[PDB]
Amino acid sequence: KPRIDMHSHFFPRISEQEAAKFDANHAPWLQVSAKGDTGSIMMGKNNFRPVYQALWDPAFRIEEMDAQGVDVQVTCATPVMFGYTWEANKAAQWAERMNDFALEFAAHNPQRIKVLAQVPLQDLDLACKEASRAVAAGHLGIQIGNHLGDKDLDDATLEAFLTHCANEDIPILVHPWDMMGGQRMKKWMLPWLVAMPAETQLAILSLILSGAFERIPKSLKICFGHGGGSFAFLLGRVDNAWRHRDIVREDCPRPPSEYVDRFFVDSAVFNPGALELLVSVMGEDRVMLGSDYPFPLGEQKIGGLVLSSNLGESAKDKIISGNASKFFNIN
Amino acid sequence: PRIDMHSHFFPRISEQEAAKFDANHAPWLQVSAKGDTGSIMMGKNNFRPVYQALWDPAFRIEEMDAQGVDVQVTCATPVMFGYTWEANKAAQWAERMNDFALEFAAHNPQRIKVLAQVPLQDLDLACKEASRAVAAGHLGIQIGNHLGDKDLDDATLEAFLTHCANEDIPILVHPWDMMGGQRMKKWMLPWLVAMPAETQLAILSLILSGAFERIPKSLKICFGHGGGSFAFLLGRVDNAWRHRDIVREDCPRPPSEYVDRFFVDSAVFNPGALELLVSVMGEDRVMLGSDYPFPLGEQKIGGLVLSSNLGESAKDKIISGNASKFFNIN
Ligand SMILES: [Mg+2]
Numbered sequence: 001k002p003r004i005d006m007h008s009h010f011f012p013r014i015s016e017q018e019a020a021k022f023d024a025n026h027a028p029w030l031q032v033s034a035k036g037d038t039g040s041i042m043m044g045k046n047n048f049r050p051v052y053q054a055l056w057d058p059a060f061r062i063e064e065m066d067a068q069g070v071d072v073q074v075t076c077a078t079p080v081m082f083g084y085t086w087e088a089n090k091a092a093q094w095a096e097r098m099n100d101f102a103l104e105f106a107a108h109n110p111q112r113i114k115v116l117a118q119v120p121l122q123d124l125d126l127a128c129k130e131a132s133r134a135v136a137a138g139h140l141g142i143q144i145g146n147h148l149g150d151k152d153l154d155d156a157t158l159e160a161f162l163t164h165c166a167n168e169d170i171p172i173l174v175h176p177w178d179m180m181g182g183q184r185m186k187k188w189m190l191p192w193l194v195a196m197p198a199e200t201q202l203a204i205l206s207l208i209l210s211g212a213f214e215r216i217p218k219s220l221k222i223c224f225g226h227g228g229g230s231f232a233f234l235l236g237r238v239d240n241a242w243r244h245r246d247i248v249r250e251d252c253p254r255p256p257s258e259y260v261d262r263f264f265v266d267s268a269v270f271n272p273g274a275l276e277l278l279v280s281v282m283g284e285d286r287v288m289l290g291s292d293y294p295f296p297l298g299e300q301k302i303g304g305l306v307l308s309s310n311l312g313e314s315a316k317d318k319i320i321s322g323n324a325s326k327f328f329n330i331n
Numbered sequence: 332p333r334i335d336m337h338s339h340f341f342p343r344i345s346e347q348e349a350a351k352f353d354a355n356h357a358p359w360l361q362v363s364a365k366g367d368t369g370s371i372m373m374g375k376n377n378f379r380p381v382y383q384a385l386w387d388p389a390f391r392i393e394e395m396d397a398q399g400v401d402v403q404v405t406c407a408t409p410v411m412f413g414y415t416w417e418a419n420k421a422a423q424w425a426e427r428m429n430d431f432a433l434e435f436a437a438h439n440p441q442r443i444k445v446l447a448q449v450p451l452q453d454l455d456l457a458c459k460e461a462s463r464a465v466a467a468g469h470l471g472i473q474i475g476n477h478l479g480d481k482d483l484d485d486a487t488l489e490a491f492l493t494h495c496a497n498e499d500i501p502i503l504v505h506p507w508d509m510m511g512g513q514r515m516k517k518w519m520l521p522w523l524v525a526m527p528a529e530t531q532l533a534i535l536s537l538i539l540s541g542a543f544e545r546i547p548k549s550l551k552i553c554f555g556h557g558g559g560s561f562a563f564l565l566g567r568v569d570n571a572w573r574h575r576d577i578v579r580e581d582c583p584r585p586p587s588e589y590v591d592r593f594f595v596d597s598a599v600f601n602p603g604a605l606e607l608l609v610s611v612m613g614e615d616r617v618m619l620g621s622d623y624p625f626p627l628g629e630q631k632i633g634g635l636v637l638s639s640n641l642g643e644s645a646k647d648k649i650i651s652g653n654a655s656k657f658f659n660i661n
Pocket residue numbers: 150151155
């Protein structure tokens with residue numbers, strides 16, 4: 001009965017010089033302060049994001065896990081590490097390096113720290129090879145971004161990657177990233193508050209409405225980050241549109257709500273009513289506790305929203321433990 | 332009583348009538364030899380397959396009688412906005428459309444109420460048309476949060492909302508659909524994803540910019556389709572405000588405290604969604620709207636609210652009471 005957090009991130013000890021070998025403007029690296037408790041993710045000479053010790057230091061992290069009552073945490077790259085816009089070979093070299101960094105991090109305590117891998121998703125052949133390599137080496141699955149520029153999950157290359165993972169029993173977590181919106185959505189974290197949930201909804205609907213679930217093997221274990229975005233709340237609208245418009249129906253033979261048995265979401269939705277609605281839509285077997293640890297807005301009491309919800313005790317148990325045990329094959 | 336405050340009409344134009352505005356930018360109705368179908372036209376190409384309830388108020392009252400709908404507030408189909416055109420030519424278009432709206436309502440003004448469109452690309456002309464249309468019988472204004480290509484949040488929009496608040500002019504907001512850029516090409520994805528996100532963005536932009544601090548409390552503003560995803564995603568917005576400096580810069584209160592400054596319609600297509608919407612907004616701030624007579628408008632008007640587990644007073648407020656106060660309907 002381990003308490004499992006399946007949505008969290010790490011960042012490796014990459015120096016500026018190391019990152020420069022790949023891309024001096026675009027490869028992220030880690031700057032750590034003198035006292036060593038805080039740092040920043042850097043991109044070239046630019047500060048990308050201020051971070052703290054739990055992000056890079058697994059010993060420090062275990063202490064916080066202890067204080068949170070988290071037994072096992074599944075962790076994966078900070079999305080800035082993805083490098084989906086890079087030349088494909090360079091991106092594959094980068095992924096292998098990051099994925100090796102991830103295993104080194106988990107090596108501190110592999111019973112309590114699990115890792116998922118990144119892949120050079122812009123090149124289907126290399127992405128499949130890295131997925132298989134990383135898993136064989138000890139990763140429990142892969143984390144990918146939810147789109148590749150104007151390519152959403154219905155794109156043939158992304159469907160093909162998902163099918164490879166299905167065929168090799170490799171679980172996937174889909175994380176929103178590279179948020180839509182252009183220029184008008186800059187201030188007050190609007191990309192995070194508006195664009196991110198729409199990104200995740202768009203990913204899920206792209207799979208459903210394109211008929212991708214009719215082609216991708218049922219074996220696929222796939223989870224959408226941050227509660228599935230706005231998906232669960234806007235599902236009624238989707239069903240209504242499918243019922244009454246032929247162009248919504250053309251590639252999708254069953255009502256869209258029926259395909260919730262083909263994917264999972266994490267529980268990171270911040271509000272009790274929102275979580276209750278999410279569970280009623282997805283089912284108790286399909287929502288996994290995930291916190292977004294250690295980022296500033298990743299719920300400071302891990303599992304606290306779930307435990308303080310109205311959900312049944314067995315639902316709470318599945319969400320906190322059972323579902324992720326099965327999803328990631330954590331014994 | 333039963334008031335449906337979200338519905339659309341289209342006037343009976345002609346090609347030549349609209350052609351003197353624009354040949355391939357100005358919309359018009361084409362009803363062929365078999366006058367029970369019709370379609371909205373732009374140039375000579377079909378913009379949208381249309382129904383005989385969109386034009387023809389006699390046809391509307393019968394359908395309104397067939398559903399338990401006593402009073403319906405109706406307004407421009409988004410196609411007729413004309414925000415892309417020259418500000419003076421769009422001002423002339425708005426008037427004709429707003430006149431068409433009144434002659435539509437004139438069929439039974441006690442049962443058909445209308446809201447007006449404005450040349451929002453020009454602040455002065457929009458404020459002037461809002462006042463003119465309201466004095467002529469319109470009960471308020473429907474705006475899009477766009478200019479057929481707009482940067483979303485500006486002093487322009489705020490200034491227009493202030494003019495309307497001061498003159499007791501209620502506002503209904505319809506969202507832009509272009510957030511997805513070159514994505515969302517299929518399966519009505521802009522309607523299913525970009526639009527609810529846009530509505531959320533419109534609301535949050537007012538909140539996070541400190542608009543509701545400068546806008547008189549007298550403003551009656553309503554957002555379409557439940558406020559999009561706003562109510563569901565508010566928990567994350569509150570959490571972000573609570574823990575991040577930049578989110579608090581121009582907004583002194585938690586964003587969820589500003590729910591009493593706007594209304595939403597009830598068009599969320601799902602029991603659980605409605606229950607959450609009413610929990611967030613309050614029973615006084617949700618109004619029944621159907622999006623009639625569009626194919627994606629709700630089937631049994633009021634059905635979702637009428638079959639809910641909400642209280643009797645709450646149900647009465649949503650179906651009739653709130654709209655009566657918002658629009659000043661007897
Ligand atoms: Mg494409």
